[PDB]
Design goal:
- This protein has 71 residues and is α+β, with helices and mostly antiparallel strands.
- The chain has a single domain, classed as Double Stranded RNA Binding Domain (2-Layer Sandwich), CATH 3.30.160.
- Helix content is 41%, strand content 27%.
- The protein is built from two helices and three strands.
- Strands 1-2-3 form a three-stranded antiparallel sheet, covered by helices on one side.
- A hairpin with a 2-residue loop joins strand 2 and strand 3.
- The longest helix is centred in the last third of the chain and has 17 residues.
């Protein structure tokens, strides 16, 4: 599955702005790192630092999903 799809579903139903994914690149040429951050419902959830985009994006959707649960 892909919590990404569900996140979009609620966006329309809730009437919220369709979530948007973003990634940033920064760090030493020897020790690079990327952080994926998602924005929705007028809120921004920061993911977990990692040396990969796959994990970064996952961390963002992971924390976001957990937060959406509490409301």
């Amino acid at each position: 599955v892909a919590y990404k799809n569900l996140l979009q579903e609620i966006a329309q139903k809730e009437s919220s702005l369709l979530p948007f994914y973003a990634t940033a690149t920064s760090g030493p040429s020897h020790a690079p790192t990327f952080t994926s951050t998602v924005e929705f419902a007028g809120k921004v959830f920061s993911g977990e630092e990692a040396k990969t985009k796959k994990l970064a994006e996952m961390s963002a959707a992971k924390v976001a999903f957990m937060s959406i649960k509490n409301g």
